[PDB]
């Protein structure tokens, strides 16, 4: 099916510039009525910032216009968002989106997955990953809990998955908290049968792309 895949996210200095790309597959970019960038900041709701029409015509939200450029590259089936003179206000998740040929055009049926842009003076920092060990023994040989603690990283986000994505049921991955150190910290847990603790291997998958850190941590009874 049609898919939009974003790149270019991460940490940006105040005054610096960003370049995002949206790679389209399963569909010709030239067939879209329009392509769009839409961002989402906490308590800001969703904000359309730019569009490019099939004939090449561009348009911008005045709330950011002048320091923003939308463009396309037909031959790579990709389109781009370039912004400069960045401020803290510009910290947000940025979505790419496809407009419609019908019913007034400017509704968005197809969205990318979104990529986070963080505007900060701080430097990147990879996480430490620590085991949250199970039980000592089960209660009543019943349901056990185990997890991974992903501590001291910057900026957001980190992704966590268990057993390379083959374990989703009973998984909870909490929102990060910002510590007073200025670094984020997050834990991810999963609940499983305690009779499986001895026979099943459990590995958490931690990825912090801004610091290029990937870790696979096996968690087992101490």
């Amino acid at each position: 099916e049609v898919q939009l895949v974003e790149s270019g996210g991460g940490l940006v200095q105040p005054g610096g510039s960003l370049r995002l790309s949206c790679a389209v597959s399963g569909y010709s970019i030239t067939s879209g009525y329009s392509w769009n960038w839409i961002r989402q900041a906490p308590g800001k709701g969703l904000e359309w910032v730019a569009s490019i029409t099939y004939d090449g015509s561009t348009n911008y939200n005045p709330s950011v216009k002048g320091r923003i450029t939308i463009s396309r590259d037909d031959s790579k089936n990709t389109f781009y968002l370039q912004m400069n003179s960045l401020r803290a206000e510009d910290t947000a998740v940025y979505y790419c989106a496809r407009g419609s040929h019908y019913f007034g055009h400017w509704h968005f049926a197809v969205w990318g997955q979104g990529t986070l842009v963080t505007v900060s003076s701080a430097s990147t920092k990879g996480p430490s990953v620590f085991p949250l060990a199970p039980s000592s023994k089960s209660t009543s040989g019943g349901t056990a809990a185990l997890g991974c603690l992903v501590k001291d990283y910057f900026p957001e986000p980190v992704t966590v998955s268990w057993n390379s994505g083959a374990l989703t049921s009973g998984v909870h991955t909490f929102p990060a908290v910002l510590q007073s150190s200025g670094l984020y910290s997050l834990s991810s847990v999963v609940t499983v049968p305690s009779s499986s603790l001895g026979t099943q291997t459990y590995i958490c998958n931690v990825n912090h792309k801004p610091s290029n850190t990937k870790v696979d941590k096996k968690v087992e009874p101490k």
Binding site: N59, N61, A145, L149, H172, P175, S187
Partner: protein
């Protein structure tokens, strides 16, 4: 520009109940018979999903319990019978004029039956300890309603100011919440005591539940 206002900003409803969300536009979004209002559903961690366009047309693939109505400056999204999967923030969006603008969003939560949390406590790992810091973690799993209380105690001394906690969004699998609390201490401080406990208060608990460990013994 055209500013859109949704109401309410937040609601909670029993499974199966009818749910209606309102969107008011600062100016009419009507154009030659059509009404250019759109609705999106955004679930945690996902892109918004188009449900309705042109005020009343149900997007392909969207369940028929979703419907849209209205015209001019006033629009309504209706869920005939709220299902657990429908936990999300809902947005209206006008497509009559640029800049295209969204409402501030409406959070819909499912009010389920009372469920007590399962409680788990975790000592810091030896691995972490060598970095000079100790994190103690308390898990409250799969409960409803969201309100819960965590108290940290170290040799029966009530800990205040040295913990932070975090809550997941409502789980559509079963409309429950989970909660994580982390107690942070220096290595030196951690090694100075023996007994670490997590005491949990919640509506589905007739009296508080406590999980603990001894740093020494096990």
């Amino acid at each position: 520009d055209i500013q859109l206002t949704q109401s309410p900003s937040s609601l909670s409803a029993s499974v199966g109940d009818r749910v209606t969300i309102t969107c008011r536009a600062s100016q009419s979004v009507d154009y030659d018979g059509d009404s250019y209002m759109n609705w999106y559903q955004q679930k945690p961690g996902k892109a918004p999903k188009l449900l309705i366009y042109a005020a009343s047309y149900l997007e392909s693939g969207v369940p028929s319990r979703f419907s849209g109505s209205g015209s001019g400056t006033d629009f309504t999204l209706t869920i005939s019978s709220l299902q657990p999967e429908d936990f999300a923030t809902y947005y209206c969006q006008q497509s009559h004029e640029d800049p295209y603008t969204f409402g501030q969003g409406t959070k819909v939560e499912i009010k389920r039956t009372v469920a007590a949390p399962s409680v788990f406590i975790f000592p810091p790992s030896d691995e972490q300890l060598k970095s000079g810091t100790a994190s103690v973690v308390c898990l409250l799993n799969n409960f409803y309603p969201r309100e819960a209380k965590v108290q940290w105690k170290v040799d029966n001394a009530l800990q205040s100011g040295n913990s932070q906690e975090s809550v997941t969004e409502q789980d559509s699998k079963d409309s429950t919440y989970s909660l994580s609390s982390t107690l942070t201490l220096s290595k030196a401080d951690y090694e100075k005591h023996k007994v670490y406990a997590c005491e949990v208060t919640h509506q589905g608990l007739s009296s508080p539940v406590t999980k603990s460990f001894n740093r020494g013994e096990c």
